[PDB]
Subunit: 153 residues, 2 copies
């Protein structure tokens, strides 16, 4: 079975983007990211708890964390469901990349439809940074843009 969703990223900056998600059944979720206006380099890219955009990107809450674990890299055992790792922005400030993930379904109890995708200001340290923020946010800095994950055909 095929389910699809999209997120339009906007924020208090010049960062804009589109993200599409698709999955079939218990399958993994394929994530296609295109974001422009980023500073060249690595950027944290996470799926956050809430699709609330009232008070800017902050209302989206923390990283989606159904298994109540600590922050990690996508390939780690111990990680938040929403830890998608880093996005690389090229010399033109554009990040295009396709990710695959197990922990962000489009159906079921752990569905991420109606939650948020956020692109961050700094590199995500994947938990291994030994900073106080390492085990919660990855020390990825402020929030550049976000969007609610909504349904598409």
């Amino acid at each position: 079975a095929t389910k699809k969703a999209v997120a339009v990223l906007k924020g208090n900056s010049n960062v804009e983007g589109v993200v599409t998600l698709s999955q079939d059944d218990d399958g993994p979720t394929t994530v296609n990211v295109r974001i422009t206006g980023l500073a060249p380099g690595l950027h944290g890219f996470h799926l956050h708890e809430y699709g609330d955009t009232t008070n800017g990107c902050m209302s989206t809450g923390a990283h989606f964390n159904p298994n109540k674990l600590t922050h990690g890299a996508p390939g780690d055992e111990i990680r938040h469901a929403g830890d998608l790792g880093n996005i690389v922005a090229n010399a033109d400030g554009v990040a295009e990349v396709t990710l695959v993930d197990n922990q962000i379904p489009l159906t079921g109890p752990n569905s991420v439809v109606g939650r948020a995708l956020v692109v961050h200001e700094l590199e995500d340290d994947l938990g291994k940074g030994g900073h106080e923020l390492s085990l919660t946010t990855g020390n990825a800095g402020g929030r550049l843009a976000c969007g609610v994950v909504g349904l598409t055909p």
Copy 2:
């Protein structure tokens, strides 16, 4: 066992707003609307099919219609699930209103999480307008603002 959702309405104009939704169980959904910058008068306010905002408010598709019926008023029998009727904008351009509805749940197959709320430019004619558009859009005109329905605490 209470579910909650929110939608932040923006668009190609000067209309902005917040909408909050809540339901418990098979219960009705409560909708709290606050929209500013509207022209004084009646405005169509509908829940559309898709949370897609790629190409403005147009990507959100038509009125959410799981039962494949024609356009109607909220109290009719023959109506789209998304037909919430009209919103009244006072002399200052502000519409505050609390609606209750049966056909826009926050769980189950007919969930509206990840879909869109749209506020329209003209009065919704509730189907009884005998225009070609009367049975599909209510002839409510262009789309002033929309937002994706996302989860909150």
